[PDB]
């Protein structure tokens, strides 16, 4: 249980800086966890951060009109591909943009909406 | 005091048709969409009907009328598209009606493939912000499909709802917390109430709530927002002659309200008063329970004329007027009295204290 | 209710008072001390039961509808197992 926690949380802490109250509160959760109650409260605080991040992903489509600007915002957001909660907000435009670049066909233009290590994804394999 | 305001009923359309669902528009509060089922007697008439009535005018007839090939069981104004009216069908097929278009026939219609819905769709709702929002639909086979209002040919996302590894959850009703777009609570025909997550590592069913010994008819989360955060609470109403108040924290019922003598078909929290909700019974009784005033008896009660079974209840967005839909298909609106509807400023802390008493 | 805490502390005081006497004493002194302490505790508990029948009357004093009265019955159901308590409530039972 500890190893899974560290595997998730070290990844989150290291990579979220890549993409201040957000970092203070994840550090606060790490302070609290350092067992079932602590784990549940940690999940509550992290998933609340994820919902706030999902609102930012909603603002993504809110702002831009053309593909290129949404692609720029996707490039700005790499930390969240690993997390399988943002994958819903990411999947919603993933079809919209992968089908767009498929119609346009560019390797960079395809990678940026499926993230690093696209070789695992089913749609990227084709 | 509850006072009769307006009966809504069409000779051609609503006769011999129960009201399957009601809903009030958000931006035009005077409007009220109401779906209906197939008329048994007349096969030639369309199975599904949906009438958008208007309270502003005195005209008895509906403001708009729509119909579709299969009986409508859910209906909802697209919360961020005023020109649209979404509805489910018994055939398991979302139908979208555009009021601007002159077609009573649906302009768009979802498939009936395996990926899309196939079983009846009793719950449809738009969730999200105006910048981005999705039409979530849940069938009675546990399938929940995300749909974009612009294009309905392909499902945005398709997933099944399950508990205890493989056991289908026959969702009969569904609600969302105010301001939450990931968590929701779905009542089941099995009598269990499931808290489920739309996106997440544990996407799907998250928690099981037991206590209802009959099929769940109507679930609704808390709507009123004030100083104190009561978002976690929600009220269920089930065929076991009970309404039950729950919190998402507690796995067991917070309380049980059973002053009835029949099934309870639909319950809804008031949208302005924190401790007020309303439940509609099978004996034709609409019962407003204000839990601050008294908890063991309804605060107010009014019976429709003729004692029809009352399938649905929907408060207005103002909370002053409440529409109830009966088996006859008459949409009777009631005016809720001043002393009941508008809350005292201390009603929030008062309901907090009553919760502390429980 | 002040009567609840008063009854609780009265019962505790009665038990302490009986507890003071050396129970294992068996001679005449022990016998008479035991009899006196038990008599004192019996009268005190009889008084606790009257302090409880006061709440039994406040049942009707407060409850207006059948459901509230029945719920007061169910909450205090164990208390009705007592012999003196059961006979006090006869009109509400019918």
From Swiss-Prot, chain B:
<keyword id="KW-0007">Acetylation</keyword>
<keyword id="KW-0225">Disease variant</keyword>
<keyword id="KW-0505">Motor protein</keyword>
<feature type="repeat" description="WD 1">
    <location>
        <begin position="14"/>
        <end position="63"/>
    </location>
</feature>
<comment type="subunit">
    <text>(Microbial infection) Interacts with human adenovirus 5 hexon protein; this interaction probably allows virus intracellular transport.</text>
</comment>
<dbReference type="GO" id="GO:0005868">
    <property type="term" value="C:cytoplasmic dynein complex"/>
</dbReference>
<dbReference type="GO" id="GO:0030286">
    <property type="term" value="C:dynein complex"/>
</dbReference>
<protein>
    <recommendedName>
        <fullName>Cytoplasmic dynein 1 intermediate chain 2</fullName>
    </recommendedName>
</protein>
<comment type="subunit">
    <text>Homodimer. The cytoplasmic dynein 1 complex consists of two catalytic heavy chains (HCs) and a number of non-catalytic subunits presented by intermediate chains (ICs), light intermediate chains (LICs) and light chains (LCs); the composition seems to vary in respect to the IC, LIC and LC composition. The heavy chain homodimer serves as a scaffold for the probable homodimeric assembly of the respective non-catalytic subunits. The ICs and LICs bind directly to the HC dimer and the LCs assemble on the IC dimer. Interacts with DYNLT3. Interacts with DYNLT1.</text>
</comment>
<feature type="repeat" description="WD 7">
    <location>
        <begin position="305"/>
        <end position="344"/>
    </location>
</feature>
<comment type="function">
    <text>Acts as one of several non-catalytic accessory components of the cytoplasmic dynein 1 complex that are thought to be involved in linking dynein to cargos and to adapter proteins that regulate dynein function. Cytoplasmic dynein 1 acts as a motor for the intracellular retrograde motility of vesicles and organelles along microtubules. The intermediate chains mediate the binding of dynein to dynactin via its 150 kDa component (p150-glued) DCTN1. Involved in membrane-transport, such as Golgi apparatus, late endosomes and lysosomes.</text>
</comment>
<keyword id="KW-0677">Repeat</keyword>
<keyword id="KW-0945">Host-virus interaction</keyword>
<keyword id="KW-0853">WD repeat</keyword>
<dbReference type="GO" id="GO:0003777">
    <property type="term" value="F:microtubule motor activity"/>
</dbReference>
<keyword id="KW-0243">Dynein</keyword>
<dbReference type="GO" id="GO:0005874">
    <property type="term" value="C:microtubule"/>
</dbReference>
<dbReference type="GO" id="GO:0005829">
    <property type="term" value="C:cytosol"/>
</dbReference>
<keyword id="KW-0991">Intellectual disability</keyword>
<dbReference type="GO" id="GO:0007018">
    <property type="term" value="P:microtubule-based movement"/>
</dbReference>
<keyword id="KW-0597">Phosphoprotein</keyword>
<keyword id="KW-0206">Cytoskeleton</keyword>
UniProtKB/Swiss-Prot annotation, chain C:
<comment type="function">
    <text>Cytoplasmic dynein 1 acts as a motor for the intracellular retrograde motility of vesicles and organelles along microtubules. Dynein has ATPase activity; the force-producing power stroke is thought to occur on release of ADP. Plays a role in mitotic spindle assembly and metaphase plate congression.</text>
</comment>
<protein>
    <recommendedName>
        <fullName>Cytoplasmic dynein 1 heavy chain 1</fullName>
    </recommendedName>
</protein>
<feature type="coiled-coil region">
    <location>
        <begin position="31"/>
        <end position="54"/>
    </location>
</feature>
<comment type="similarity">
    <text>Belongs to the dynein heavy chain family.</text>
</comment>
<comment type="subunit">
    <text>Homodimer. The cytoplasmic dynein 1 complex consists of two catalytic heavy chains (HCs) and a number of non-catalytic subunits presented by intermediate chains (ICs), light intermediate chains (LICs) and light chains (LCs); the composition seems to vary in respect to the IC, LIC and LC composition. The heavy chain homodimer serves as a scaffold for the probable homodimeric assembly of the respective non-catalytic subunits. The ICs and LICs bind directly to the HC dimer and dynein LCs assemble on the IC dimer. Interacts with DYNC1LI1; DYNC1LI1 and DYNC1LI2 bind mutually exclusive to DYNC1H1.</text>
</comment>
């Amino acid at each position: 249980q500890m190893r899974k926690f560290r595997r998730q949380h070290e990844q989150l802490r290291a990579v979220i800086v890549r993409v201040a109250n957000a970092i203070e509160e994840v550090n606060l959760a790490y302070e609290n966890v350092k067992w079932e109650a602590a784990m549940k409260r940690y999940d509550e605080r992290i998933d609340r951060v994820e919902t706030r991040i999902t609102a930012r992903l909603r603002d993504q489509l809110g702002t831009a009109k053309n593909a290129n600007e949404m692609f720029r915002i996707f490039s700005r957001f790499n930390a969240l591909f690993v997390r399988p909660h943002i994958r819903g907000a990411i999947r919603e435009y993933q079809t919209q943009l992968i089908q767009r670049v498929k119609d346009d066909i560019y390797m960079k233009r395809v990678e940026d909406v499926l993230g690093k290590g696209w070789e695992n994804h089913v749609e990227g394999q084709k | 005091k509850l006072s009769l305001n307006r009966q809504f009923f069409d000779e051609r359309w609503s006769k011999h048709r129960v009201v399957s669902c009601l809903d009030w528009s958000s931006q035009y509060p005077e409007l009220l969409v109401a779906s209906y089922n197939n008329n048994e007697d007349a096969p030639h008439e369309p199975d599904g009907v949906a009438l958008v009535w208007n309270m502003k005018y005195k005209k008895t007839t509906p403001e708009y009328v729509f119909h579709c090939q299969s009986a409508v069981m859910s209906a909802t104004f697209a919360k961020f598209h005023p020109n649209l009216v979404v509805g489910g069908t018994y055939s398991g097929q979302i139908v979208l009606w555009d009021n601007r278009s002159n077609k009573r026939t649906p302009v768009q219609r979802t498939p009936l493939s395996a990926a899309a819905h196939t079983h009846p769709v009793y719950c449809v709702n738009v969730v999200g912000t105006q910048n981005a929002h999705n039409l979530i639909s849940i069938s009675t086979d546990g399938k929940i499909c995300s749909w974009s209002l612009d294009m309905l040919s392909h499902p945005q996302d398709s997933m099944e709802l399950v508990h205890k590894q493989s056991k289908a959850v026959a969702v009969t009703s569904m609600s969302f917390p105010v301001g939450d777009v990931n968590n929701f609570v779905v009542g089941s025909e099995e009598g269990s109430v499931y808290t489920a997550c739309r996106h997440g590592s544990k996407a799907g069913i998250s928690e099981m709530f037991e206590g209802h010994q009959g099929p769940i008819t109507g679930i609704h989360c808390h709507a009123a927002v004030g100083a104190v955060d009561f978002s976690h609470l929600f009220v269920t109403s089930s065929f076991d002659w009970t309404v039950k108040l729950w919190t998402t924290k507690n796995n067991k019922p917070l309380y049980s309200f059973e002053d009835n003598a029949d099934y309870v078909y639909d319950v809804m929290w008031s949208p302005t008063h924190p401790a007020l909700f309303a439940c509609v019974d099978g004996m034709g009784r609409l019962d407003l329970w204000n839990l601050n005033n008294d908890t063991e008896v309804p605060t107010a009660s009014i019976s429709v004329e003729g004692n029809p079974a009352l399938n649905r209840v929907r408060w207005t967005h103002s909370g002053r007027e409440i529409a109830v839909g009966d088996s006859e298909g008459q949409i009777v609106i009631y005016d809720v009295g001043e002393q009941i509807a508008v809350p005292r400023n201390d009603e929030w802390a008062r309901f907090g204290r009553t919760l502390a008493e429980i | 209710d002040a009567a609840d805490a008063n009854a609780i502390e009265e019962v505790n005081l009665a038990y302490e008072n009986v507890k003071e006497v050396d129970g294992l004493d068996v001679s005449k002194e022990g016998t008479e001390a035991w009899e006196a302490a038990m008599k004192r505790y019996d009268e005190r508990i009889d008084r606790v039961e009257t302090r409880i029948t006061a709440r039994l009357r406040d049942q009707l004093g407060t409850a207006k509808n059948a459901n509230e009265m029945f719920r007061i019955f169910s909450r205090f159901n164990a208390l009705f197992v007592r012999p003196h308590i059961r006979g006090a409530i006869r009109e509400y039972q019918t």
